[PDB]
Amino acid sequence: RITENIETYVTHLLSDLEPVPSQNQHLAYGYPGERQVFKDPMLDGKQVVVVNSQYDKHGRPVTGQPDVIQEANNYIDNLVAAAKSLIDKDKKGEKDLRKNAIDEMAKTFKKSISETIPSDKAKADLFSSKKSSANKDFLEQLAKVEGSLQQFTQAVAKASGHKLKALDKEGHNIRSHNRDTLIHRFKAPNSKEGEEQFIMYIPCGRYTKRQQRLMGKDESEVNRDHDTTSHKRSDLVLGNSSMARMIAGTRHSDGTVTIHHDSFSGPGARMPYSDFKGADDYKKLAIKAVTLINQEEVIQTLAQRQIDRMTNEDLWNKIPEEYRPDELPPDAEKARAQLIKLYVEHNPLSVTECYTQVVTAGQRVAAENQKEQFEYVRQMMDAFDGSKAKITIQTGSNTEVETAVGYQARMSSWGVNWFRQVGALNPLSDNSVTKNQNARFVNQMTDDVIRNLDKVAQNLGDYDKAGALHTLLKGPDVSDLNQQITEKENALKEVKGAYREALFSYFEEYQKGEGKWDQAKLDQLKNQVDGYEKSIKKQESAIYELHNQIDALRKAYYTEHKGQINKALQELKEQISPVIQNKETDPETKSRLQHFYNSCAYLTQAQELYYENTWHHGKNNFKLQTLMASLSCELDYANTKGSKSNNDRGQRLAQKIVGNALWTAMSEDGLYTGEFLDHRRTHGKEVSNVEQLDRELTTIQALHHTANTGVSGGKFEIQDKANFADNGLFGKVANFAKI
Numbered sequence: 001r002i003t004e005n006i007e008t009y010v011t012h013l014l015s016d017l018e019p020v021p022s023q024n025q026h027l028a029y030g031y032p033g034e035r036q037v038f039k040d041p042m043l044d045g046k047q048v049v050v051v052n053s054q055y056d057k058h059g060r061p062v063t064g065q066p067d068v069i070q071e072a073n074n075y076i077d078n079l080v081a082a083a084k085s086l087i088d089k090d091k092k093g094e095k096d097l098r099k100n101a102i103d104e105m106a107k108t109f110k111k112s113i114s115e116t117i118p119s120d121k122a123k124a125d126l127f128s129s130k131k132s133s134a135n136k137d138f139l140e141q142l143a144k145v146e147g148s149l150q151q152f153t154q155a156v157a158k159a160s161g162h163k164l165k166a167l168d169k170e171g172h173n174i175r176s177h178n179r180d181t182l183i184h185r186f187k188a189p190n191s192k193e194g195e196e197q198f199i200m201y202i203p204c205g206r207y208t209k210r211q212q213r214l215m216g217k218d219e220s221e222v223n224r225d226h227d228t229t230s231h232k233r234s235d236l237v238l239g240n241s242s243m244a245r246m247i248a249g250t251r252h253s254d255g256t257v258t259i260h261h262d263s264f265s266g267p268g269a270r271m272p273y274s275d276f277k278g279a280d281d282y283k284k285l286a287i288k289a290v291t292l293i294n295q296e297e298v299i300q301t302l303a304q305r306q307i308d309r310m311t312n313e314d315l316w317n318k319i320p321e322e323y324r325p326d327e328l329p330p331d332a333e334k335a336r337a338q339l340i341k342l343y344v345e346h347n348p349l350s351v352t353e354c355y356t357q358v359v360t361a362g363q364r365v366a367a368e369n370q371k372e373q374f375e376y377v378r379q380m381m382d383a384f385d386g387s388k389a390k391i392t393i394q395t396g397s398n399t400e401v402e403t404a405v406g407y408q409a410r411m412s413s414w415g416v417n418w419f420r421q422v423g424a425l426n427p428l429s430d431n432s433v434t435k436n437q438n439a440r441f442v443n444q445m446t447d448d449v450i451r452n453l454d455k456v457a458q459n460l461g462d463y464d465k466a467g468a469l470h471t472l473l474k475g476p477d478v479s480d481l482n483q484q485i486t487e488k489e490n491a492l493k494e495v496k497g498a499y500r501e502a503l504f505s506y507f508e509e510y511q512k513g514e515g516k517w518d519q520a521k522l523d524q525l526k527n528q529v530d531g532y533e534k535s536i537k538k539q540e541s542a543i544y545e546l547h548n549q550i551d552a553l554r555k556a557y558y559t560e561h562k563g564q565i566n567k568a569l570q571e572l573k574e575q576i577s578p579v580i581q582n583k584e585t586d587p588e589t590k591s592r593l594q595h596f597y598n599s600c601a602y603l604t605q606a607q608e609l610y611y612e613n614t615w616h617h618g619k620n621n622f623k624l625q626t627l628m629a630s631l632s633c634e635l636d637y638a639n640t641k642g643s644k645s646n647n648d649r650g651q652r653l654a655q656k657i658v659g660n661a662l663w664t665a666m667s668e669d670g671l672y673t674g675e676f677l678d679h680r681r682t683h684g685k686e687v688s689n690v691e692q693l694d695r696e697l698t699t700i701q702a703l704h705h706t707a708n709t710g711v712s713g714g715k716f717e718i719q720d721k722a723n724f725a726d727n728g729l730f731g732k733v734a735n736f737a738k739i
C-alpha cells in the first residue's frame with residue numbers, strides 16, 4: 001500500500017480532486033455526472049470514482065438506481081476494450097480494420113438502443129416492488145436490451161477473431177490490472193450539521209517475492225502491483241482477487257475524518273476455481289499449493305495494513321529510545337520510511353486474520369467447488385497458524401524490508417444462499433461439512449473474549465456491573481480440555497512447517513509441465529506432502545474431537561444462563577451509557593467502555609444464534625456472520641470476508657457489517673443495540689432511519705461490481721425481503737456479465 005498512514009490517505013481522498021476526461025478513464029462506468037472520475041491525490045496514474053447521493057422530492061434516492069441504457073453503454077464499451085486488447089496482442093493481421101469495425105458496431109448498437117428504449121422506462125426503482133408497473137416496464141426494457149447485447153457480442157466475436165470465453169478472460173484481465181478507488185459519500189440519518197458519512201473500496205494488491213518470481217517477473221522490484229501480462233500462462237495463476245480495503249467513517253466540516261470501520265472486502269476464492277474442472281490429483285494438489293502461496297500474500301497484506309494504521313508518533317513510541325535518530329529527515333515521506341524501517345527491525349510483528357466465509361460448503365448442486373473453497377482455505381490458514389511467515393513490508397516508494405510476521409487464523413463458514421441449511425435427509429446439501437470448524441471457531445472467539453476480559457476487567461472495577469457480566473461470560477470451566485487442545489496444537493507446528501515447505505517445492509516442479517517434467521521428483525514430492533497431510537488430518541480430528549466436547553458443555557451452560565447474561569448486559573449498558581454521554585468524560589475512557597460493551601454484546605448475540613441454531617432462519621440470514629465479523633473487528637483482528645467471486649454474497653455481508661458499524665457509531669452511546677440487524681425493512685413510501693441508511697448501501701456494491709465485471713450488479717438472491725431495503729434489481733443487470 002502507499003506507505004502513507006491510512007487516515008491521512010482517506011483525508012486526501014475526500015479532498016478536492018482533479019477531474020479526469022472520459023477518454024482517459026481506465027474503464028467505462030456510465031451514469032455521467034453521478035459516477036465522477038478523478039486522479040488519485042497520492043499515486044501517479046491511479047484514479048478515483050466518487051458518487052454523491054442525490055434524492056428526489058420525496059427523499060428517495062436518484063443515485064444508485066439501475067438504468068439499462070447506461071448499463072448497455074458500460075457493457076458495449078468495456079467489451080470493446082477487451083476486444084481491442086485481444087486484437088493488439090494477437091498474431092493475425094488487419095488489426096485496424098478489425099478494431100474500426102468493432103467501433104462501428106458499437107456506434108450502431110448504442111444508437112439503436114437509444115432509438116428503442118424510452119428513457120422514461122429505462123430506469124428501475126430499487127426501493128419499490130419489482131411488480132410495480134414502472135419496474136415491470138424496466139424489466140421489459142431490460143429483456144429487450146439483453147437481446148441487443150447478445151447480438152452485439154456475437155458480432156464482436158466474429159469480427160475480432162476471438163471467442164466469447166477469451167474476450168471475457170481478457171476483460172477480467174485488464175480491469176484488475178489498474179483498479180480504481182471507489183467512494184460513496186452521503187449524509188446518514190441523524191448526521192450532524194455540516195458532517196457527512198462515507199464508504200470506500202481501496203484496492204490492495206501486493207505480490208510476495210515468491211509470487212513475483214513464479215509469475216515470471218523478478219523479485220528485486222519494490223513495486224509489486226498485480227500483473228498477468230509478464231506471466232507465462234500455465235493454467236494456474238497466482239495472486240488473490242476481488243480484494244479491497246474497506247473504510248467507512250464520517251467527515252467533519254473541517255475535513256477531518258473519524259474512521260468507524262476498517263476491514264477487507266474479500267478476497268474472493270483464494271484459489272483458481274476454474275482450474276478445478278477436469279483435474280487429476282496432481283492438478284488438485286497444485287491448486288492447494290496456489291492456495292498456500294496466496295495465503296502468504298494475505299499475510300503480507302495484513303502486516304502492511306498494521307503499518308498503515310500507525311501514525312508517525314505510534315512508530316516513534318515503539319522504537320526503543322536508543323535507536324531513534326537524533327535527526328528525522330526534512331522530507332515527510334523519507335521520515336515515515338525511516339520510522340517504518342526502525343519499527344519493523346525492532347518489533348516482532350503479529351497479525352490475526354478473521355475470515356468470515358459465506359459460501360455454502362456442503363452444497364451438492366451447482367456446487368462450484370464451494371467444498372474446496374472452505375476446505376483448502378481452512379487448511380492453509382491453519383498451516384500458517386502459530387508460526388511465522390517471511391514477508392515484505394513496503395516502507396517508501398522505492399524502499400522495502402523483510403520481516404517474519406506471526407500469524408493467527410480464525411475461520412468460519414456459514415452459508416447464506418437457499419442451500420445454507422437444508423432439511424433432514426435432503427440430498428441437495430450436506431450441512432455437516434463445516435460443523436467441526438464452526439464449533440472450533442466459536443470456541444476460539446469466545447476464549448479470545450475471555451482472555452480479553454481477564455486482562456481489562458481486572459483493572460476497571462469502578463464499574464460493578466462489568467464484573468458480574470465477566471463472571472457469567474467465563475462460561476463453564478473448560479481449562480483442562482483447552483490445555484489439551486493447546487498441547488496438541490503446539491505438537492502440529494513442526495509437521496505444518498514441513499508440510500508448508502514441501503508443498504511449496506511441489507509447485508516449483510509441477511509448474512514446469514510436460515516437456516519439462518521430472519516425474520520421479522514430482523511423485524516423490526507429492527508423496528512427502530501426502531504423508532504430512534495424512535498426519536496433520538489425523539491430529540486435526542482429535543483436536544476437533546476435543547472442541548466438540550467444549551461445544552457440548554458451552555451449549556448446556558448457555559441454554560441455562562441466557563436470561564442472566566442478558567439482564568447483566570442490560571445492566572452494564574444502564575450504568576455505562578450515562579458516563580459515555582457525560583461531556584466531561586475523556587475520549588480514551590469512552591473508547592474503553594464502548595469496546596468492552598460492544599465486544600460482549602456481539603459475543604452474546606452470536607451465542608444465541610449459534611447455540612439455539614437459529615442463524616439459518618430467513619429473518620436471521622446474515623446476523624451470525626455479521627456479529628462475528630463485528631466482534632473480530634473489536635478485538636482488532638483483520639476481518640476478511642468472502643464468497644467465490646465476492647460480487648454477490650460477500651458484498652451483502654459487507655453491507656450488513658458497514659451499515660451496522662455506521663448505525664452504531666452514530667448513536668448517542670456508540671453502543672450496539674442490533675436495530676440495524678433486527679429491523680424489518682418494509683419498502684414503503686415512508687421508512688425508518690435504519691431502512692433509510694440501508695437504501696444507501698447498494699451503491700458502492702454497483703460500483704465494485706462494475707469494476708470487476710464491466711456492469712453493475714450484485715445478483716444475490718434475497719432469502720427474506722425484510723433483510724434488505726432494495727429489491728435485487730441490480731441482479732438482473734448483473735446477468736449482462738454472463739452473456
Ligand SMILES: [Hg+2]
Pocket residue numbers: 203204205206240243244301
Ligand atoms: Hg489484498
Ligand SMILES: [Hg+2]
Pocket residue numbers: 449453595596597599600
Ligand atoms: Hg467484553
Ligand SMILES: [Hg+2]
Pocket residue numbers: 260261262630632633634
Ligand atoms: Hg470494529
